[PDB]
Structure formats: structure tokens, C-alpha cells
Design an enzyme around this catalytic site. Structure first.
Site, PDB file in Angstrom:
ATOM      1  N   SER A  13      50.791  56.171  19.973  1.00 26.03           N
ATOM      2  CA  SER A  13      51.600  55.088  19.395  1.00 26.03           C
ATOM      3  C   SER A  13      50.778  54.206  18.454  1.00 26.03           C
ATOM      4  CB  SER A  13      52.230  54.234  20.497  1.00 26.03           C
ATOM      5  OG  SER A  13      51.255  53.893  21.430  1.00 26.03           O
TER       6      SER A  13
ATOM      7  N   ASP B  77      49.258  65.401   8.347  1.00 27.05           N
ATOM      8  CA  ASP B  77      49.128  64.151   7.627  1.00 27.05           C
ATOM      9  C   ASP B  77      48.999  62.970   8.562  1.00 27.05           C
ATOM     10  OD1 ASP B  77      52.507  63.384   6.541  1.00 27.05           O
ATOM     11  OD2 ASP B  77      51.881  64.306   8.429  1.00 27.05           O
TER      12      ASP B  77
ATOM     13  N   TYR C 237      53.559  52.892  13.331  1.00 31.73           N
ATOM     14  CA  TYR C 237      54.523  53.864  12.791  1.00 31.73           C
ATOM     15  C   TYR C 237      55.644  54.083  13.786  1.00 31.73           C
ATOM     16  CZ  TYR C 237      52.432  56.898  16.260  1.00 31.73           C
ATOM     17  OH  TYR C 237      51.969  57.432  17.446  1.00 31.73           O
ATOM     18  N   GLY C 238      55.312  53.836  15.060  1.00 35.02           N
ATOM     19  CA  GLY C 238      56.189  54.124  16.188  1.00 35.02           C
ATOM     20  C   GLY C 238      55.433  54.752  17.337  1.00 35.02           C
ATOM     21  N   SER C 239      55.980  55.853  17.831  1.00 36.64           N
ATOM     22  CA  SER C 239      55.649  56.338  19.162  1.00 36.64           C
ATOM     23  C   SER C 239      55.857  57.849  19.348  1.00 36.64           C
ATOM     24  CB  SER C 239      56.578  55.594  20.105  1.00 36.64           C
ATOM     25  OG  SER C 239      56.004  55.474  21.331  1.00 36.64           O
TER      26      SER C 239
ATOM     27  N   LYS D  88      58.484  62.418  17.987  1.00 39.08           N
ATOM     28  CA  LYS D  88      58.081  61.080  17.452  1.00 39.08           C
ATOM     29  C   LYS D  88      59.296  60.248  17.154  1.00 39.08           C
ATOM     30  CE  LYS D  88      56.066  60.863  13.477  1.00 39.08           C
ATOM     31  NZ  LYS D  88      54.984  60.851  12.424  1.00 39.08           N
TER      32      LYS D  88
HETATM   33  C1  LIG Z   1      48.486  66.874  25.763  1.00 38.94           C
HETATM   34  O1  LIG Z   1      47.037  66.644  26.028  1.00 38.94           O
HETATM   35  C2  LIG Z   1      46.191  66.198  25.033  1.00 38.94           C
HETATM   36  C3  LIG Z   1      44.801  66.501  24.983  1.00 38.94           C
HETATM   37  C4  LIG Z   1      44.058  65.977  23.927  1.00 38.94           C
HETATM   38  C5  LIG Z   1      44.663  65.179  22.907  1.00 38.94           C
HETATM   39  O2  LIG Z   1      43.913  64.695  21.858  1.00 38.94           O
HETATM   40  C6  LIG Z   1      44.170  65.308  20.561  1.00 38.94           C
HETATM   41  C7  LIG Z   1      46.043  64.850  22.961  1.00 38.94           C
HETATM   42  C8  LIG Z   1      46.844  64.066  22.032  1.00 38.94           C
HETATM   43  C9  LIG Z   1      48.070  64.929  21.677  1.00 38.94           C
HETATM   44  C10 LIG Z   1      48.916  64.483  20.464  1.00 38.94           C
HETATM   45  O3  LIG Z   1      49.009  63.319  20.156  1.00 38.94           O
HETATM   46  N1  LIG Z   1      49.638  65.497  19.974  1.00 38.94           N
HETATM   47  C11 LIG Z   1      50.470  65.461  18.908  1.00 38.94           C
HETATM   48  C12 LIG Z   1      50.776  64.355  18.108  1.00 38.94           C
HETATM   49  C13 LIG Z   1      51.713  64.428  17.051  1.00 38.94           C
HETATM   50  C14 LIG Z   1      51.990  63.349  16.229  1.00 38.94           C
HETATM   51  N2  LIG Z   1      51.127  62.305  16.101  1.00 38.94           N
HETATM   52  C15 LIG Z   1      51.588  61.474  15.211  1.00 38.94           C
HETATM   53  S1  LIG Z   1      50.755  59.983  14.773  1.00 38.94           S
HETATM   54  C16 LIG Z   1      51.725  59.350  13.437  1.00 38.94           C
HETATM   55  N3  LIG Z   1      52.737  61.957  14.729  1.00 38.94           N
HETATM   56  C17 LIG Z   1      53.015  63.109  15.335  1.00 38.94           C
HETATM   57  C18 LIG Z   1      54.182  63.786  15.038  1.00 38.94           C
HETATM   58  C19 LIG Z   1      55.117  64.221  16.001  1.00 38.94           C
HETATM   59  C20 LIG Z   1      56.319  64.887  15.658  1.00 38.94           C
HETATM   60  C21 LIG Z   1      56.600  65.158  14.332  1.00 38.94           C
HETATM   61  F1  LIG Z   1      57.754  65.844  13.954  1.00 38.94           F
HETATM   62  C22 LIG Z   1      55.665  64.748  13.367  1.00 38.94           C
HETATM   63  C23 LIG Z   1      54.483  64.081  13.683  1.00 38.94           C
HETATM   64  C24 LIG Z   1      52.226  65.711  16.783  1.00 38.94           C
HETATM   65  C25 LIG Z   1      51.907  66.808  17.542  1.00 38.94           C
HETATM   66  N4  LIG Z   1      50.993  66.687  18.622  1.00 38.94           N
HETATM   67  C26 LIG Z   1      46.753  65.393  24.043  1.00 38.94           C
HETATM   68  C1  LIG Z   2      51.252  67.872   5.633  1.00 37.77           C
HETATM   69  C2  LIG Z   2      50.095  67.557   4.658  1.00 37.77           C
HETATM   70  C3  LIG Z   2      50.698  67.161   3.308  1.00 37.77           C
HETATM   71  C4  LIG Z   2      49.930  65.972   2.665  1.00 37.77           C
HETATM   72  C5  LIG Z   2      50.614  64.632   2.920  1.00 37.77           C
HETATM   73  C6  LIG Z   2      50.191  63.567   1.888  1.00 37.77           C
HETATM   74  C7  LIG Z   2      51.084  63.482   0.614  1.00 37.77           C
HETATM   75  C8  LIG Z   2      51.816  62.144   0.703  1.00 37.77           C
HETATM   76  O1  LIG Z   2      52.639  61.944  -0.495  1.00 37.77           O
HETATM   77  C9  LIG Z   2      52.296  60.575  -0.984  1.00 37.77           C
HETATM   78  O2  LIG Z   2      52.211  59.404  -0.211  1.00 37.77           O
HETATM   79  C10 LIG Z   2      51.382  58.345  -0.744  1.00 37.77           C
HETATM   80  C11 LIG Z   2      51.621  57.109   0.162  1.00 37.77           C
HETATM   81  O3  LIG Z   2      51.934  55.803  -0.453  1.00 37.77           O
HETATM   82  C12 LIG Z   2      51.537  58.104  -2.191  1.00 37.77           C
HETATM   83  O4  LIG Z   2      50.241  57.549  -2.455  1.00 37.77           O
HETATM   84  C13 LIG Z   2      51.781  59.327  -2.937  1.00 37.77           C
HETATM   85  O5  LIG Z   2      52.334  58.915  -4.068  1.00 37.77           O
HETATM   86  C14 LIG Z   2      52.851  60.142  -2.301  1.00 37.77           C
HETATM   87  O6  LIG Z   2      52.881  61.115  -3.101  1.00 37.77           O
END
Ligand SMILES: COc1ccc(OC)c(CCC(=O)Nc2cc(-c3[nH]c(SC)nc3-c3ccc(F)cc3)ccn2)c1
Ligand SMILES: CCCCCCCCO[C@@H]1O[C@H](CO)[C@@H](O)[C@H](O)[C@H]1O
Ligand SMILES: CCCCCCCCO[C@@H]1O[C@H](CO)[C@@H](O)[C@H](O)[C@H]1O
Ligand SMILES: CCCCCCCCO[C@@H]1O[C@H](CO)[C@@H](O)[C@H](O)[C@H]1O
EC number: 2.7.11.24
Length: 326
Positions: free
Chosen positions: A28, A162, A29-31, A47
Site C-alpha cells: 500500500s 512499472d 496510489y492505493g492498496s 489492486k
Molecule cells: C506473497 O509473498 C511475498 C514474498 C515477497 C514479496 O516481496 C516482493 C512480496 C510482495 C508481493 C507483491 O507485492 N506482489 C505484487 C504486487 C503488485 C502490485 N504492486 C503494486 S504497487 C503500485 N501494484 C501492483 C499491481 C497489482 C495489480 C495490477 F493489475 C497492477 C499492479 C502486483 C503483483 N504482485 C510477497
Molecule cells: C509496463 C512498463 C511500461 C512503462 C511504463 C512507463 C510509461 C508511462 O507513460 C508516461 O507517464 C509519465 C508520468 O507523468 C509521463 O511522464 C509520460 O508522459 C507518460 O508517457
């Protein structure tokens, strides 16, 4: 519309399709919660965006993130398994949930400050490059590629993320240069690759100037052709006041050759992802018929100044129109 259930997680009420079970918070942008997707049999990360339509900026961000995730369809780049809202109409629409494969290790976890074997480095960097070819073909630049943005599973399959340090940023990013080339990301690959080979950070700068000085000490003062591309005399005078087969001792000479083509100060002379894939270092993995490019990506939205309710509507349209992948 599937049937949803409710549950309290990370201090708010989550409302998710029944297919998703055993939600458990993980970040946890959110969660973010881990879950099991009973439809597919996959471990997933769900997420729940925080305040997605609070402001024009949040709304545009939410729309960007969804459009990006929906576009990305490639083995080495994060993709979208699902997107949903419990809302039944636009007028009711306030919440967005995004679902992808659960990831439990990044490239730092894979390394642990240990030299990897050369064969391992080939396979990892090949996958990053294969991803980057795809991303760059859609006219997208990551701009902050680093180990913590690289997920690796137990079979050593890598995905570019990303989300999760300035050590791997391109120097022109560090100078707020603008007009970025896609080879900004190639700088970053060279930094990662170096570190995989040696087990050490290549440019472990303490602060911003320290980092730039470490870079200049490695690759040397800009040459004549690069100096022509810099208008400021003061920038030139300052740079000059500041000014491989040796630093990468024992490595495969093809790795060193590749590093030399990636870690080039002049972005216009860095190897591209597609040229790097055809470099001899990757002969064991290279397949020109399986290094796919992306469909064109309509980024007209990025130059738009719209109101919140329009960014929200566009997002809603993208939620509704989502087709899950095969
Ligand atoms: C389960 O046991 C673990 C062991 C080690 C560990 O450290 C990496 C972790 C952390 C696991 C984790 O956070 N996994 C994760 C995060 C994400 C994630 N994190 C963020 S931060 C902005 N966004 C996403 C996410 C989730 C869904 C989606 F469609 C896009 C991004 C996506 C996929 N997997 C877990
Ligand atoms: C999944 C990996 C793809 C790369 C993700 C990064 C591309 C994000 O895209 C970007 O976001 C930025 C945020 O303000 C801007 O600076 C850029 O204009 C916009 O293009
Ligand atoms: C330690 C480095 C000292 C500062 C180097 C800054 C030089 C780059 O500065 C850049 O030059 C470009 C080309 O003229 C301009 O288009 C960019 O706006 C400017 O950011
Ligand atoms: C460390 C101080 C010197 C850094 C020099 C970085 C030079 C980066 O390379 C430059 O990148 C720009 C795209 O951003 C291009 O417009 C330039 O043509 C290219 O020369």
C-alpha cells in the site's frame, strides 16, 4: 455481471467478484491484496486504486494506468488479467480494481549481491531486451528501469513492471534533458547487466552530482560529436572541469562488447533493444520470429486537458470494454 462480495481490507471496504478468494493484504496510489483466482487457478494481485477520480490529475493517471495495462500483451511485460468495478452504471462509478499475476521476487532477490553465471546473465538480459523491444515499438519509454521494477518467478521468467534509487537512470534523465530517446532504457539495462556480472552497483552515487561524476569517470568526457549537441558553454566548461575490458575483468568478451554499446553517453549512439537482441551474446536465445512488436498505442490522450468527469467516463468505457486474455 458476476456476484460480488464484500470484506474489510486496508481500512476500506473491498467489493470483488466471487471468483477471487482468500484476499490478503500485501502492500500500500492505493492498496494491493494477494488472492486466488478460482476461475483460472492463478495466484493474483488485486489492486484497489486510492481516490482514483479525486482530481483531474488523479483521473488522468487512473486512465493512463488502465490504458497501459490493457495494451501490454507480451510475456516479458506486466499484463492485465482483469479489471472491475462493483458499479452498475457510470453515475455509480467510483472504484477501480486491477488484477495481474501475483509476483513474489524481483531481480534484487534473484541476485543477492552475487555474481550470476554468464549463461544466467544472458537469459535475464535477453528477456528484459525482448520486453523493451515490445514496449519501445508502441512508442513507450519506461524512464526508470531498475532491478525493483523487474519481476522474476521460480522458472526464471522475467516481467518488466512499472512499479516496485537513481543508480540505473540514464544521465540525460538525470539532467532533465527532455526529448528522450527510447535508449534511455538501454542505459538502464547496461547498468543492470553490469551489476549482474560483477555483483556490484555500477554507479552507486551518494547524491545526484556524485552519480554524474561516477558516470563520467567510467565512460569518459564527452567526445567532439556529443559536445556539439550541447548548446550551453557553461554546461560544457563544467563538464570539462569534471574530466571496460578492465572494469569487467574476467567477463565474456561478448558481454563486454554489448556493455560498451549500451553504456554510451550519447543516446543517439546507444544500441537499440532490437539491435541488442541480434548481438552474438544472445545467440543461444535469439529468435527473430519470436521477439514480437506491439500493436500501435493511441497515446492522443496524453496531450489532452479534460475535465474530471470526462477522464472518469473514458476510464469507465475501458473497464466495460475489457476482454480477458486467453
Ligand atoms: C506473497 O509473498 C511475498 C514474498 C515477497 C514479496 O516481496 C516482493 C512480496 C510482495 C508481493 C507483491 O507485492 N506482489 C505484487 C504486487 C503488485 C502490485 N504492486 C503494486 S504497487 C503500485 N501494484 C501492483 C499491481 C497489482 C495489480 C495490477 F493489475 C497492477 C499492479 C502486483 C503483483 N504482485 C510477497
Ligand atoms: C509496463 C512498463 C511500461 C512503462 C511504463 C512507463 C510509461 C508511462 O507513460 C508516461 O507517464 C509519465 C508520468 O507523468 C509521463 O511522464 C509520460 O508522459 C507518460 O508517457
Ligand atoms: C555535470 C553535467 C553538467 C550539466 C550538463 C547539462 C547539459 C545538458 O543540458 C541540456 O542541453 C540540451 C542540449 O543543448 C538542452 O536542449 C536541454 O534543455 C538541456 O537540458
Ligand atoms: C553526464 C553528463 C553528460 C551526459 C550527456 C548525456 C547525453 C545524452 O544523449 C543525448 O540525448 C538527447 C535525448 O535526450 C538527444 O537529443 C541528444 O541528441 C543525445 O546526444
Amino acid at each position: 455481471r458476476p456476484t460480488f462480495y464484500r470484506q474489510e481490507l486496508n481500512k476500506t471496504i473491498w467489493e470483488v467478484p466471487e471468483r477471487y478468494q482468500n484476499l490478503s493484504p500485501v502492500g500500500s496510489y492505493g492498496s494491493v491484496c494477494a488472492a486466488f483466482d478460482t476461475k483460472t487457478g492463478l495466484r493474483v494481485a488485486v489492486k484497489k486504486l486510492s481516490r482514483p477520480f479525486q482530481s483531474i490529475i488523479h483521473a488522468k493517471r487512473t486512465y493512463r494506468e488502465l490504458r497501459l495495462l490493457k495494451h501490454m500483451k507480451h510475456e516479458n511485460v506486466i499484463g492485465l488479467l482483469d479489471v472491475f468495478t462493483p458499479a452498475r452504471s457510470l453515475e455509480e462509478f467510483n472504484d477501480v480494481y486491477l488484477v495481474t499475476h501475483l509476483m513474489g521476487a524481483d531481480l534484487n532477490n534473484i541476485v543477492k549481491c552475487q555474481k550470476l553465471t554468464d549463461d544466467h546473465v544472458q537469459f535475464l538480459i535477453y528477456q528484459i531486451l525482448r520486453g523493451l523491444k515490445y514496449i519501445h515499438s508502441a512508442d513507450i519509454i519506461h524512464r526508470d528501469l531498475k532491478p525493483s521494477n523487474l519481476a522474476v518467478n521460480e522458472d526464471c521468467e522475467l516481467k518488466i513492471l512499472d512499479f516496485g534509487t537513481r543508480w540505473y537512470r540514464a544521465p540525460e534523465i538525470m539532467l532533465n534533458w527532455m526529448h528522450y530517446n527510447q535508449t534511455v532504457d538501454i542505459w538502464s539495462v547496461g547498468c543492470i547487466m553490469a551489476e549482474l556480472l560483477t555483483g556490484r552497483t555500477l554507479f552507486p552515487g551518494t547524491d545526484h552530482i556524485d552519480q554524474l561524476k561516477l558516470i563520467l569517470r567510467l565512460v569518459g568526457t564527452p567526445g567532439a560529436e556529443l559536445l556539439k549537441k550541447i548548446s550551453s558553454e557553461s554546461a560544457r566548461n563544467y563538464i570539462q572541469s569534471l574530466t571496460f575490458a578492465n572494469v569487467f575483468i574476467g567477463a565474456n568478451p561478448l558481454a563486454v562488447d554489448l556493455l560498451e554499446k549500451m553504456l554510451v553517453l550519447d543516446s543517439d549512439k546507444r544500441i537499440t533493444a532490437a539491435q541488442a537482441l541480434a548481438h552474438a551474446y544472445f545467440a543461444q536465445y535469439h529468435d527473430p520470429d519470436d521477439e514480437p512488436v506491439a500493436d500501435p498505442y493511441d497515446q492522443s490522450f496524453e496531450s489532452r486537458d479534460l475535465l474530471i468527469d470526462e477522464w472518469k467516463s473514458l476510464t469507465y468505457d475501458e473497464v466495460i470494454s475489457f476482454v480477458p486474455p486467453p
